[PDB]
Design goal:
Chain B: Its main location: membrane. The complex is a heterodimer of chains A (114) and B (143). Chain A is α+β, with helices and mostly antiparallel strands. Helix content of chain A is 59%, strand content 16%. Chain A is elongated, with a radius of gyration of 17 Å. Chain B has one domain: Glucose Permease (Domain IIA), CATH 2.70.70. Classes of the chains: A alpha+beta (114), B mainly beta (143).
Amino acid sequence: DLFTTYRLDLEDARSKEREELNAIVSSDDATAKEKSEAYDKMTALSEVEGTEKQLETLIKTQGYEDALVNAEGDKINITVKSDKHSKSKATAIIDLVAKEIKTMKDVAVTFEPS
Amino acid sequence: NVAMPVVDSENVSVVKKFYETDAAKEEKEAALVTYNNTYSLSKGIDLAEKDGKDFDVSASLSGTVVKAEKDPVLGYVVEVEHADGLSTVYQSLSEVSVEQGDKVKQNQVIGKSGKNLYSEDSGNHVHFEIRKDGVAMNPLNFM
């Protein structure tokens, strides 16, 4: 499932950072300032994951049996499960990303067919 | 003093605007750029001749060229840096008249208009952007 593998390997991206940060925080040769900066990053990442979660939720809320949001970067990538797709649909989606985010540079919605 | 980046400024019209949320929908819809199944925001404006046809792409206000090249997605792209964080961008070119490092003067021609993945219809067009410290702004607010 082109969608579902999109999800799975975004979660690997995320599982590998989670892992790399923890590598530092449990190491001897990292200073307690260095160890904290790592923690800070884990925290920030989790915040990101919780907003992605809300946007997917709000998005599935108008049709869309599934949604996948990557808000990490400057450009926010959105993947949705849809056979139908239009300039109309995209705006409805973009519209509500704007309303939950300023700081927002570009948005890219992909409607992936089942 | 921001130059419309087209030598012949008649017959060349803006076919796509800079996407503004908090703007009428359907003009938002006309500010989307798209390829295959995916839609994105227009970060600049798109210029083009009625009927479609190529044409020369003049620099907007002058300065040094930071980038010139083909991008598989964007066609031919040139970037020109300017004073205090400003830069302009020209994409979907069919070719380029300069190389990185070239000093350029406003209204100095560069490559003609072209196509890239985002072309809808039969092309061609130029994509133009203005950026303050890398952030894109509505180029029409400078014209």
